[PDB]
């Protein structure tokens, strides 16, 4: 089987084909268009209708090119760009219409890992390893390995933003450059000290700029390209004795190029003051490679989320056991409401509710009061690695809303996720927590039987329960009440 | 000579003290039934008449406290002002009745002080489980040797289950049975904690405890010893009557008929889900756990001091950071301080310290919006020594500590003024940026700050910036920053 990871970038947006082969990996097809996302991106951060034209045309052709590829062997990744649009949902609703793939956002910590394992796929050297990517729109910085990152650092400068900010009317002079490469040794003071202590035993650089260095240092007699303090002195005087982007006549430079190089050099020179950098190489692997394996992974059922969920329990020591009793009761629920809607009950989703009653109370050692918020927080925020921008923001929202009352109106706008999909979620959250409100004193219901109608659903306890146990009753009662303020939900409580 | 005043549901209560000998001496007891929390409409509004009452009460308790410096006083609110949404009006028209300001303070630090106050008061020993039913809120502890070990408030009282079970004060088998499960379902998710935390005693503090002893003591037991059998005889009285004006029990003031019931329905209620044998009533509590705090502080015994430095250990945060920030922040307020003596009182100066310590606590949630993550940690937690305007203030100053500052944005205080604090954000933005390498850091040997109100200058020794670039870069950001800030200029000098 062959499988496509996309990438929307900044400059381009990407593809890649590849299939397993022999239990090993082959890369197929590579295609990309320019589609110049990032130069539509305004002052206030919104992105101009002719670069969205740009970008679903593109996504257009793609989608023609992909004819016949299931959604499981495809994956299209949006990044900084996408990030840092104000309307990037406009985008994605846009984009649904020409490409039957739905497009997920990653962070940049996420981005950076993806990079990581990209060079650790591509590269027979183990050993610690600094990774460098300047893009379009942020710059990565990952120390790890045997495919685990020790620090991830992601930021906001690329060689776009800095065109704009730093060489207006793409004039070079070398108070425009020492702006740009301050500005850039600026952005990373705060991760300095940390990642020289860390060390690496080689420096691995990705994408544009870091290629283009590469190029151009070969064709100043440099055989091995390889990026050195020295070579980048004699990268920046060669840029120097020009004027302006358009008159930039570099050997080993593409007319494309020539348009942002001189601030990615820029950026690639306070990285190197900032990280006193000896010797970087390029890497032959970045984030598409790293998407490709990652998706291999989960064919074999290799998910690092769960690592991720396990981490995130332990770090904030929750009751593991009340974790488990309230997993449980909400998943023999789960189970009669899949039942009975198997075409509503999608495994993703599944996974997101599971990993929510794992983790809704990691927030307990902020406050017991208020409680659910201080879990969203958390879960929210967090550097989650595995997860993409909508499932962890689902996973937040599931555990935003297991307790008190609950506003349809306030509920984020998924592009991954439809409310028929998410909203009995909540419901069973609700309900698995609410019947173990007592903790380990809980007396679980030997039986408990759901019978769904549309949001309309019965639970069916056994004969005489609730004389024994009134308290839980009361609780029901009290979650009666808060769906009657939810339209379309009814809940009814019965005995057998 | 020092006083401590409670604005309750059913009173408002002032208590002032003295220590002679080493000893606490009560000098005084002052008390006016305001019905602070009858005036709480079904919107959660207090009414008019309410707070003209309160405001009435306060300029009598400010005659009698006259003279008092300011640490000499301490004005708390609990549940009542907690709740009313109206709160802020009524702490904005206290200013002009009393000079000292009202301190509203959290349902788990309102435990911790009634825990602190049965212990400094009571001879019992050993661990103790400490109740206290009030007219909005009910508080329970556990804990022992002064240290609170389990903390957990209610919101259950005798006044808001009046309304809620017995409407009309009528009195049924049937309200009070929903008063008494209504009370357990409150206590679901602590009762199995408590229980297996045990307590070798079981103390009971206030006015629904206070009301069921007389009555029990009035007719005709034994001992002050409260128990299951006795309270059941106590609901078995009650229900003999239909409504509470009927109430002839002896012990029973006209001011308790109004709430005794639903009280004894909670304490029921407590008595069930913790399985209590025996309770003693305290004559200690909340008052008594603010007398001693004072007291305490007066003697340089800050308990915000362990909880500063306990957050700190807890989040892991590099604590030489905190350090070089807090050495930077505090070099420039103490000359801040000697240029405007009268903007700098020891209170906010203490939260600029803790906000300099703190500001890192965040970092475990993420490295990207700092400033927020470590501010929600701080504006969210349980912070015992904290009132819940020095908690909201130290989370602000963290808030602000990054990044353009919207003044649009701030909450708005009542025990701090905009003129006060504002240069602490700029002390602690400051102190922050300027340590931005970490350990790296180069210390400028010597900083001179001149202030003209907000237009600051900053001046460092001669061309210290040219072996420090990356440093004048960020006060250039910072300086830009001010400029979206009307009344902030900030000038970088060397000489």
Known sequence: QEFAAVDLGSNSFHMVIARVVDGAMQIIGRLKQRVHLADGLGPDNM??????????????????????????????????????????????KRAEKVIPYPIEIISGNEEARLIFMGVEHTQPEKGRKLVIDIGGGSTELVIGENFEPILVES??????????????????????????????????????????????????????????????????????????????????????????????????????????????????????????????????????????????????????????????????????????????????????????????????????????????????????????????????????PGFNQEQQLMMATLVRYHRKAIKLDDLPRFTLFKKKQFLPLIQLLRLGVLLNNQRQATTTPPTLTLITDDSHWTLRFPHDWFSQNALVLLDLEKEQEYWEGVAGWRLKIEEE
């Open 47 to 92: 992105l101009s209708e002719e670069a969205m034209t740009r970008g679903l045309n593109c996504l257009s052709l793609f989608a023609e090119r992909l004819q016949g590829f299931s959604p499981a062997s495809v994956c299209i990744v949006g990044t900084h760009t996408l990030r840092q649009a104000l309307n990037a949902t406009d985008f994605l």
């Open 155 to 384: 930021r906001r400068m690329g060689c776009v933003s800095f065109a704009q900010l730093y060489f207006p009317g793409g004039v070079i002079n070398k108070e425009n450059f020492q702006r740009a490469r301050m500005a850039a040794a600026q952005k990373l003071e705060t991760l300095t000290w940390q990642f020289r202590i860390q060390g690496w035993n080689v420096a691995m650089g990705a994408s544009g700029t870091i290629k283009a260095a590469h190029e151009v240092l070969m064709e100043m007699g440099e055989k091995d390209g390889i990026i050195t303090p020295e070579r980048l002195e004699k990268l920046v005087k060669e840029v120097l004795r020009h004027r302006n982007f358009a008159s930039l006549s570099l050997p080993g430079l593409s007319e494309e190029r020539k348009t942002v190089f001189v601030p990615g050099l820029a950026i690639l020179c306070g990285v190197f003051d900032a990280l006193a950098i000896r010797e970087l190489r390029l890497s032959d692997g970045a984030l598409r490679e790293g998407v490709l394996y990652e998706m291999e992974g989960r064919f074999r059922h290799q998910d690092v989320r769960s690592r991720t969920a396990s981490s995130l329990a332990n770090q904030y020591h929750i009751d593991s056991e009340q974790a488990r009793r309230v997993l449980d009761t909400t998943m023999q629920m789960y189970e009669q409401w899949r039942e009975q809607q198997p075409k509503l009950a999608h495994p993703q989703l599944e996974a997101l509710l599971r990993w929510a009653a794992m983790l809704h109370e990691v927030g307990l050692n902020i406050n017991h009061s208020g409680l659910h918020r201080h879990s969203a927080y958390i879960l929210q925020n967090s550097d989650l």
